[PDB]
Amino acid sequence: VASQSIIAYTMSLGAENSVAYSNNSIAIPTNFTISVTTEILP
Amino acid sequence: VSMTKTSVDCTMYICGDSTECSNLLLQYGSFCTQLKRALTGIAVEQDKNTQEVFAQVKQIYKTPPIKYFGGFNFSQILPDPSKPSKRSFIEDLLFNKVTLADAGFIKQYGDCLGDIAARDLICAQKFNGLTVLPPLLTDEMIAQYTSALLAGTITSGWTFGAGAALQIPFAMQMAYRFNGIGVTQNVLYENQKLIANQFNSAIGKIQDSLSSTASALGKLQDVVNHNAQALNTLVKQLSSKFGAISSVLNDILSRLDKVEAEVQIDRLITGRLQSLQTYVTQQLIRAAEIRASANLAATKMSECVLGQSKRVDFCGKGYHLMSFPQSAPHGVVFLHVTY
Amino acid sequence: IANQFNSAIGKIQDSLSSTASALGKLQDVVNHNAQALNTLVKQLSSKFGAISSVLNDILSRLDKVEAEVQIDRLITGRLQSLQTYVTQQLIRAAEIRASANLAATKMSECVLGQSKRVDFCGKGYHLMSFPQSAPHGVVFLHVTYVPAQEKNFTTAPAICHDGKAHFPREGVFVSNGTHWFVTQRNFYEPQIITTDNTFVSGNCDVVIGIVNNTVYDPLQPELDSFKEELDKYFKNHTSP
Amino acid sequence: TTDNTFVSGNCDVVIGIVNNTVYDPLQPELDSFKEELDKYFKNHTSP
Ligand SMILES: *[C@@H]1O[C@H](CO)[C@@H](O[C@@H]2O[C@H](CO)[C@@H](O[C@H]3O[C@H](CO)[C@@H](O)[C@H](O)[C@@H]3O)[C@H](O)[C@H]2NC(C)=O)[C@H](O)[C@H]1NC(C)=O
Ligand SMILES: *[C@@H]1O[C@H](CO)[C@@H](O[C@@H]2O[C@H](CO)[C@@H](O[C@H]3O[C@H](CO)[C@@H](O)[C@H](O)[C@@H]3O)[C@H](O)[C@H]2NC(C)=O)[C@H](O)[C@H]1NC(C)=O
Ligand SMILES: *[C@@H]1O[C@H](CO)[C@@H](O[C@@H]2O[C@H](CO)[C@@H](O[C@H]3O[C@H](CO)[C@@H](O)[C@H](O)[C@@H]3O)[C@H](O)[C@H]2NC(C)=O)[C@H](O)[C@H]1NC(C)=O
Ligand SMILES: *[C@@H]1O[C@H](CO)[C@@H](O[C@@H]2O[C@H](CO)[C@@H](O[C@H]3O[C@H](CO)[C@@H](O)[C@H](O)[C@@H]3O)[C@H](O)[C@H]2NC(C)=O)[C@H](O)[C@H]1NC(C)=O
Ligand SMILES: *[C@@H]1O[C@H](CO)[C@@H](O[C@@H]2O[C@H](CO)[C@@H](O[C@H]3O[C@H](CO)[C@@H](O)[C@H](O)[C@@H]3O)[C@H](O)[C@H]2NC(C)=O)[C@H](O)[C@H]1NC(C)=O
Ligand SMILES: *[C@@H]1O[C@H](CO)[C@@H](O[C@@H]2O[C@H](CO)[C@@H](O[C@H]3O[C@H](CO)[C@@H](O)[C@H](O)[C@@H]3O)[C@H](O)[C@H]2NC(C)=O)[C@H](O)[C@H]1NC(C)=O
Ligand SMILES: *[C@@H]1O[C@H](CO[C@@H]2O[C@@H](C)[C@@H](O)[C@@H](O)[C@@H]2O)[C@@H](O[C@@H]2O[C@H](CO)[C@@H](O)[C@H](O)[C@H]2NC(C)=O)[C@H](O)[C@H]1NC(C)=O
Ligand SMILES: *[C@@H]1O[C@H](CO)[C@@H](O)[C@H](O)[C@H]1NC(C)=O
Ligand SMILES: *[C@@H]1O[C@H](CO)[C@@H](O)[C@H](O)[C@H]1NC(C)=O
Ligand SMILES: *[C@@H]1O[C@H](CO)[C@@H](O)[C@H](O)[C@H]1NC(C)=O
């Protein structure tokens, strides 16, 4: 048994991430993606 | 970036808790709900402005446990766990150099009962149907967004703006910058310990400058002051008479009867309602002037923090290397770094 | 790159077909111009203190001396209603002018050019954009290169060889764990470290974290094949 | 050097052009490759 109801919550700002930084490590993309995005202006 | 999210209740402002005036306000029609709709339009936009300046980052980035970045010393711009709100050291200067007249948080009447309501004008604004609403993003959340924009910048340069964050050693990121301003990267590595000392000294001068004068944050304090001046002017406008026998409805209703009392009340409604049409016009004009600043601040966030700028004098004075955002009450401070 | 672009622009059909809410920023302009005029025409029902809001009732029921004192209440409130509408329209018009100047700037810099501006012409490194018209607006299709499938590499700011320090001409040094290469910064495409992949300045003591590797000289093995051509001539020349 | 610079035209079209040497990084080692050739010829008189 389950049912829809109003909830309240503290909003999330985004997913958590820690960057793997080190003073001799670099990350380089081996591939790419081409992406199309709409921007709408009055 | 934003200004105080005010709201007004026109029945309480124009003539609260008198039915004898409420029944005359309706002769004018929707002039109240147009003003409530206009002020709600502004109040919803302040959270859009705060979202578009700070929420530029996909993910909440954390800096590594070992705080070594090629000798550059970010210790006063990064957050420290020890404070209740996880603001940086320089954000804690800025948060104190601007004094908020009313933050908009809860007021449990225990202040507004007794003597403080005679000594306080904010409680007297509340009693006249004028209120300040809180922002959606708290000063912890804005500081958290700022710590993610800053952690991304030092651990990954522009790459977290264009795609996923890609780590690169800070001295090589700064070398990629040097190439960007047309100074070949060997000039950085041959001077790295000098360049670090120069930056670490320049960051030290900002702490002292912000500890030494208040007048530099005038652009933020002036916004708080113009909001507070407007709600103070709007509550003083209750004391005017507009050609009526009194400025107080309780006197007009205690001293007259309906057939000529309604002739005094028409003057006070017409005056008070004009006193709102003016306030809402000043706020709409202020709201547009602030937006034109929040869109500039978002444009500097994208083009100075998430990138490196060729625009002359856009991202500080000099040839731009990089910039760090810091949150301030109703605003943003950019620490633009330049060669 | 064509199949990526062709399939990406295919999702724009669905992003527009499937949801109702995609053009909310333009619908809001129409909704505000409608709700402002619908408000302005309801204000004709307000009495402003007169005995009727219908101006012909005043003119049916009263003579000039007190008809004009009722009419003037309606002239005053109606005139204020227009003054409110025209002030609101001037305030909105000055916001739509800012959006038009931004849109003319995006047309100039994203469409007629290519922009280095970060996130100005959509997220990613900007390639190009296509304008499409809409009622009371413009929709830009921005096309961007977005990096993908990254790998960790070890790196160094310089390579040390003949006691001299070598720096990348363009790109960055990387190691897969056993060999050292130059690669361009934005796309992994490794090459042997050479005299042409690099430029030189100073001895290997000034730079911090400099690493030891050979640097290949594209002239030397070919000059050496010319030494062996000279050497076979010398050995054969012992016979005449 | 001939690495630092690129050529175009001739010295009569530019205004305020100045004379100088321009060095060639290939020559000194190609000339060491002449000293390598020349020593081998002088020695090869003996076999
Ligand atoms: C870079 O990313 C590309 C995807 O964004 C990727 O292209 C895709 O490659 C895979 C195979 O590796 C293809 O997948 C199909 O392959 C065959 C059928 O042709 C089937 O066995 C598989 O199950 C699957 O259906 C994709 O079709 C292909 N996509 C496109 C648009 O070409 C590249 O391979 C990546 N390049 C590098 C160097 O990693
Ligand atoms: C980055 O810059 C910081 C500011 O200069 C610096 O922190 C400062 O470091 C000194 C030396 O440790 C502290 O001096 C105090 O040291 C201890 C603290 O318990 C006391 O015994 C001393 O009497 C003296 O007061 C500064 O107080 C400290 N300042 C702050 C704001 O923390 C960092 O150390 C620098 N980072 C690196 C890696 O060098
Ligand atoms: C480029 O400009 C730099 C300053 O912006 C300059 O760095 C400064 O160099 C002087 C010495 O020339 C240092 O002065 C200190 O030197 C020793 C102690 O190490 C003492 O004898 C002196 O009394 C004095 O304390 C500065 O400390 C140094 N500043 C920094 C931030 O490192 C460079 O030397 C200039 N380089 C060139 C090639 O012009
Ligand atoms: C790091 O990248 C290196 C270059 O891709 C790679 O080295 C290459 O490894 C292959 C074997 O996997 C060698 O192949 C040679 O095998 C024999 C060796 O005697 C020869 O007969 C063949 O002709 C062929 O040349 C490559 O020669 C070798 N390249 C070099 C320049 O040495 C490494 O294996 C990579 N390391 C890691 C940890 O992935
Ligand atoms: C990177 O390669 C360098 C070149 O091979 C290498 O330098 C060599 O380092 C050793 C140890 O420091 C030096 O050895 C000398 O050290 C002192 C005199 O300075 C004496 O006690 C010793 O007997 C000996 O003479 C070498 O002289 C030096 N090579 C040269 C040409 O000077 C680096 O150590 C290498 N580094 C890494 C991390 O691989
Ligand atoms: C740059 O170097 C050039 C080459 O050395 C040099 O050009 C030479 O200029 C002189 C003077 O104009 C010429 O001398 C001749 O002038 C007339 C005939 O034209 C005669 O009266 C002279 O006796 C003599 O023959 C050279 O012919 C000319 N050489 C070449 C190859 O063009 C420039 O003058 C130098 N300029 C500077 C500013 O240093
Ligand atoms: C890049 O590597 C880090 C961890 O360092 C690596 O450790 C070895 C396994 C080897 O790959 C070395 O060459 C590297 O130095 C990765 O970060 C970890 O990611 C896992 C999830 O995949 C996570 O559980 C750990 O907590 C992470 N550790 C840290 C310190 O962040 C990182 O994901 C790698 N990046 C990519 C693009 O693959
Ligand atoms: C970076 O270099 C410093 C100074 O040599 C060193 O203390 C630190 O351990 C290095 N960082 C990492 C992640 O090891
Ligand atoms: C050796 O020199 C003779 C000419 O003296 C020539 O015919 C012959 O092809 C040469 N061979 C080689 C291997 O150089
Ligand atoms: C001359 O050639 C011989 C081999 O024929 C070699 O032993 C000798 O060292 C060479 N000397 C010089 C100076 O090249």
Side-chain angles (χ1 to χ4, degrees):
Chain A
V1 177
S3 60
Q4 307 270 76
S5 70
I6 312 287
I7 59 163
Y9 56 85
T10 304
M11 63 181 281
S12 52
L13 305 189
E16 291 288 317
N17 194 316
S18 53
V19 185
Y21 179 92
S22 170
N23 52 354
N24 71 355
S25 179
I26 192 167
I28 300 188
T30 71
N31 206 354
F32 50 72
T33 55
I34 304 297
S35 64
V36 179
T37 58
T38 49
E39 175 169 35
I40 304 101
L41 288 142
Chain B
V1 171
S2 68
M3 69 176 189
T4 57
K5 290 171 58 186
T6 50
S7 86
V8 177
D9 184 75
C10 337
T11 289
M12 182 165 277
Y13 178 72
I14 292 178
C15 52
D17 70 53
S18 61
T19 64
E20 296 93 337
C21 173
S22 302
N23 290 329
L24 266 65
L25 233 176
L26 305 181
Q27 301 301 266
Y28 298 78
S30 62
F31 272 79
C32 173
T33 190
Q34 291 165 62
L35 272 41
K36 186 174 292 196
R37 187 170 66 220
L39 289 167
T40 303
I42 295 165
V44 173
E45 181 186 69
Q46 306 315 292
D47 294 323
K48 186 182 182 64
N49 283 11
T50 310
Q51 191 78 350
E52 292 192 306
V53 177
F54 291 103
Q56 290 259 335
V57 71
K58 302 176 182 177
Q59 302 180 66
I60 303 304
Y61 297 115
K62 276 165 165 157
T63 51
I66 299 175
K67 303 292 182 293
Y68 181 82
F69 305 100
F72 296 75
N73 188 2
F74 304 119
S75 191
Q76 282 81 233
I77 65 165
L78 287 175
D80 49 356
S82 63
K83 295 173 172 57
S85 56
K86 298 177 171 62
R87 288 190 307 255
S88 77
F89 180 98
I90 289 184
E91 283 179 308
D92 260 16
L93 303 184
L94 302 170
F95 187 86
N96 284 7
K97 303 320 288 176
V98 168
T99 55
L100 291 178
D102 193 4
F105 306 128
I106 209 169
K107 298 297 178 188
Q108 65 254 305
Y109 278 68
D111 59 334
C112 274
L113 299 186
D115 308 1
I116 291 167
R119 162 219 192 198
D120 178 25
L121 190 49
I122 282 57
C123 180
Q125 292 167 11
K126 187 178 181 70
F127 294 94
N128 284 101
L130 311 178
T131 68
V132 177
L133 306 171
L136 178 61
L137 295 184
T138 77
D139 299 312
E140 305 88 38
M141 291 187 174
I142 297 170
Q144 189 174 0
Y145 274 133
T146 302
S147 78
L149 286 159
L150 182 53
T153 298
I154 67 180
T155 64
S156 75
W158 46 69
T159 65
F160 83 93
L166 303 175
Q167 75 277 9
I168 182 171
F170 190 91
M172 296 183 71
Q173 199 208 129
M174 190 66 67
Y176 296 88
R177 299 178 176 268
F178 266 58
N179 287 330
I181 69 166
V183 174
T184 184
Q185 60 189 114
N186 99 84
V187 176
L188 183 143
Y189 303 127
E190 294 183 357
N191 297 273
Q192 178 191 334
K193 207 166 181 165
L194 170 60
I195 290 161
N197 282 355
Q198 287 207 48
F199 175 75
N200 295 349
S201 188
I203 287 291
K205 290 174 185 172
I206 303 304
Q207 301 167 213
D208 289 0
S209 180
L210 296 178
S211 304
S212 183
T213 182
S215 61
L217 279 86
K219 294 188 181 186
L220 302 183
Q221 191 65 55
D222 294 343
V223 174
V224 178
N225 294 0
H226 288 179
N227 295 150
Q229 179 175 60
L231 292 185
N232 286 350
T233 298
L234 185 62
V235 77
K236 287 175 186 183
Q237 287 269 59
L238 296 174
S239 295
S240 293
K241 290 184 180 178
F242 314 116
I245 60 158
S246 175
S247 56
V248 177
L249 248 69
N250 305 39
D251 302 350
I252 285 159
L253 295 172
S254 304
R255 299 175 37 203
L256 301 181
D257 91 67
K258 191 174 288 192
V259 69
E260 81 278 20
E262 289 184 353
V263 184
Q264 310 296 331
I265 299 287
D266 165 289
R267 292 180 174 88
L268 297 182
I269 295 171
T270 305
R272 296 185 178 184
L273 183 63
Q274 174 166 220
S275 308
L276 293 175
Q277 288 171 206
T278 300
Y279 169 68
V280 176
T281 302
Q282 305 309 53
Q283 287 298 104
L284 280 172
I285 291 171
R286 292 182 174 89
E289 179 182 334
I290 292 289
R291 208 205 301 108
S293 182
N295 293 346
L296 180 67
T299 299
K300 296 202 181 201
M301 190 78 69
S302 307
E303 299 177 24
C304 314
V305 182
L306 274 60
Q308 181 187 19
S309 195
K310 306 294 152 61
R311 304 181 65 179
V312 172
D313 296 353
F314 191 66
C315 304
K317 168 182 172 195
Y319 300 102
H320 181 231
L321 295 178
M322 70 193 308
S323 302
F324 312 113
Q326 295 294 262
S327 67
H330 309 308
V332 70
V333 178
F334 292 103
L335 305 179
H336 301 295
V337 190
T338 71
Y339 173 102
Chain C
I1 291 159
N3 288 338
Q4 289 213 56
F5 174 75
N6 294 349
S7 59
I9 200 159
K11 294 189 294 180
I12 307 306
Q13 296 183 220
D14 296 353
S15 183
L16 296 175
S17 297
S18 295
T19 176
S21 56
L23 273 68
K25 297 183 65 188
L26 304 183
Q27 189 63 51
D28 289 353
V29 178
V30 180
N31 289 6
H32 289 179
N33 300 150
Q35 287 170 352
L37 286 175
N38 284 355
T39 306
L40 184 65
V41 82
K42 288 163 178 268
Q43 291 264 51
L44 294 170
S45 298
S46 293
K47 297 170 181 177
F48 300 122
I51 64 169
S52 176
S53 52
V54 178
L55 187 67
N56 301 307
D57 294 342
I58 312 305
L59 291 173
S60 302
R61 293 162 59 158
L62 306 181
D63 69 87
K64 194 63 51 66
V65 181
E66 66 231 32
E68 80 184 358
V69 177
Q70 293 291 298
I71 294 165
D72 191 65
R73 307 297 295 270
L74 304 178
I75 292 173
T76 300
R78 301 196 185 178
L79 187 61
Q80 208 77 53
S81 304
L82 290 176
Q83 205 70 67
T84 303
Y85 173 79
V86 176
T87 300
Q88 291 276 16
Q89 287 294 104
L90 282 166
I91 287 172
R92 283 177 167 114
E95 164 184 346
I96 300 295
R97 197 205 310 122
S99 184
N101 287 337
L102 172 64
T105 304
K106 298 223 178 191
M107 195 72 75
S108 301
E109 296 177 40
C110 313
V111 185
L112 271 62
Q114 182 188 16
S115 193
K116 276 278 169 73
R117 302 183 61 181
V118 172
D119 294 7
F120 183 64
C121 309
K123 290 186 172 289
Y125 299 99
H126 165 280
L127 296 173
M128 68 200 312
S129 306
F130 308 122
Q132 298 286 270
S133 64
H136 294 303
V138 67
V139 175
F140 291 92
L141 307 185
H142 304 295
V143 190
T144 69
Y145 176 102
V146 171
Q149 300 187 247
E150 71 284 350
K151 273 188 61 66
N152 289 327
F153 299 99
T154 299
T155 189
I159 256 73
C160 182
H161 182 48
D162 291 338
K164 289 137 59 179
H166 296 255
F167 306 89
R169 273 270 202 64
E170 169 254 26
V172 69
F173 295 125
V174 287
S175 182
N176 68 353
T178 61
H179 295 69
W180 283 90
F181 306 111
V182 166
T183 178
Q184 69 190 260
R185 311 183 205 275
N186 305 299
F187 182 78
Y188 179 70
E189 173 158 306
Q191 295 190 332
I192 301 301
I193 306 178
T194 83
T195 295
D196 292 311
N197 276 347
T198 64
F199 74 90
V200 171
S201 179
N203 49 335
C204 301
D205 58 343
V206 190
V207 180
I208 302 168
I210 187 165
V211 300
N212 290 327
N213 202 85
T214 188
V215 177
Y216 175 85
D217 180 356
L219 186 149
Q220 184 67 16
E222 186 277 324
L223 169 151
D224 214 13
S225 78
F226 185 49
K227 176 281 198 182
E228 294 309 331
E229 177 188 324
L230 171 63
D231 210 357
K232 271 195 168 194
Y233 277 50
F234 281 123
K235 300 300 177 181
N236 192 24
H237 198 270
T238 69
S239 69
Chain D
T1 73
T2 307
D3 289 354
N4 281 334
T5 62
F6 80 89
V7 182
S8 183
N10 49 5
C11 310
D12 51 303
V13 304
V14 180
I15 301 165
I17 180 165
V18 298
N19 287 320
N20 199 73
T21 191
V22 173
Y23 174 92
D24 179 0
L26 182 145
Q27 281 294 342
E29 68 163 312
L30 174 141
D31 214 21
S32 82
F33 190 100
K34 174 262 164 183
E35 296 311 317
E36 172 182 353
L37 178 149
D38 205 11
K39 276 195 173 188
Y40 266 58
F41 273 104
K42 296 302 181 180
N43 189 24
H44 195 275
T45 66
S46 67

